[PDB]
Paper text:
XopAI, encoded by XAC3230 in Xac, is a putative type III effector composed of 296 amino acids. XopAI resembles a bent right hand, and it can be dissected as a two-lobe structure with an N-terminal α-helical lobe (residues 74 to 193), and a C-terminal β-sandwich lobe (residues 194 to 296). XopAI possesses a highly negatively charged surface at its central cleft, whereas a positively charged surface is required for interacting electrostatically with the negatively charged phosphate group of NAD+ in mARTs. From analyses of the crystal packing, we found that XopAI uses an altered mART domain to bind its own N-terminal peptide containing a conserved Arg residue.
To study the influence of this N-terminal region on the crystallization of XopAI, we produced an N-terminal-truncated protein, XopAI-ΔN70 (by deleting the first 70 residues) and grew the crystals. The crystals belong to space group P21, and they diffract with a resolution of 2.26 Å. The structure of XopAI-ΔN70 was solved via molecular replacement. In XopAI-ΔN70 crystals, the asymmetric unit contains four copies of the protein. However, we did not observe a thread-like and tandem protein packing in XopAI-ΔN70 crystals. This result suggests that the intermolecular association of the central cleft and the N-terminal sequence is responsible for the observed tandem packing in the crystals of the full-length XopAI protein. More interestingly, the coordinates of the central cleft in the XopAI-ΔN70 crystals show that these residues still have similar sidechain conformations in the absence of the Arg peptide. The loop structure found in the P41212 peptide-bound state is in a stretched conformation, whereas that in the monomer D of the ΔN70 crystal structure is in a contracted conformation. For example, the central cleft in the P41212 peptide-bound state has a volume of 722 Å3; however, that in the monomer D of the ΔN70 crystal structure has a volume of 159 Å3. When mapping these structures onto the energy landscape, we found that three monomers share a similar PN loop structure near well C, whereas the other one has a distinct loop structure near well E. Unlike apo structures, the peptide-bound structures constitute a discontinuous energy landscape.
Residue numbers in the entry: 73 to 296
């Protein structure tokens, strides 16, 4: 549709704006609508209440944490929304082979705006751990040893291997320099989630293979 054109436009914006990416007033209005209608018209009243609840929670969070005073409240909402089941419609929205949805793109712009709007003191510096069920070819197409991966996905990780951890077929150990800690905004803060936007670059240093789980363990380092 025109969604294809919107996707490539957004991917171009992501790389051109870099850390200056910022959502516009209407982009936030569109994100609000996308989130409230995401399950269809029958759940709009419930998801309008969820939205209003998240707005008030994030409005008060800015009151309690003045360093967040100039983050759009909707952008913060985007970060809590990311930690719900809604992440499934936006995590891959900018992948080359993904079929974009209007709601996916709306979500994406405000999550990206949030991540580059958070003050640097929210960056986690150190190793963050990720597990996902992905196929070997999926890994090979995206990560090769001693090559740089320009990630087009929203890449989730954790400061820890905590109770949230569960062994998966693919694992990452990613040295973070500016990956942002969003536990303060998540519905489950004790996961200590760290989230990288599309456009993050990783120097892949080595990829381990096992016939056990993890089948593939990727070691990579974020770079400027």
């Amino acid at each position: 549709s025109d969604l294809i054109k919107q996707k490539k436009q957004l991917w171009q914006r992501v790389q051109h704006d870099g850390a200056q990416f910022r959502s516009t007033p209407e982009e936030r209005k569109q994100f609000k609508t996308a989130l409230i209608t995401l399950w269809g018209e029958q759940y709009r009243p419930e998801r309008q209440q969820r939205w209003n609840g998240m707005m008030q929670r994030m409005a008060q969070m800015k009151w309690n944490h003045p360093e967040l005073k100039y983050m759009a409240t909707e952008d913060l909402v985007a970060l809590q929304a990311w930690t719900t089941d809604d992440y499934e419609v936006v995590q891959d929205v900018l992948e080359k082979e993904a079929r974009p949805t209007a709601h996916g793109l709306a979500f994406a712009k405000c999550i990206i705006s949030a991540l580059h709007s958070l003050p640097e003191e929210y960056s986690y510096q150190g190793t963050v751990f990720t597990g996902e069920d992905q196929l070997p070819d999926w890994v090979s197409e995206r990560y090769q040893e001693r090559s740089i991966t320009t990630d087009r996905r929203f890449f989730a990780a954790s400061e820890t291997k905590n109770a949230s951890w569960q062994g998966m077929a693919v694992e990452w150990e990613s040295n973070s320099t500016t990956g942002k800690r969003i536990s303060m905004f998540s519905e489950r803060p004790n996961e200590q989630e760290v989230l990288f936007p599309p456009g993050t670059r990783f120097q892949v240093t080595r990829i381990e293979e096992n016939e056990t789980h993890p089948r593939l363990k990727i070691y990579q380092s974020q770079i400027a």
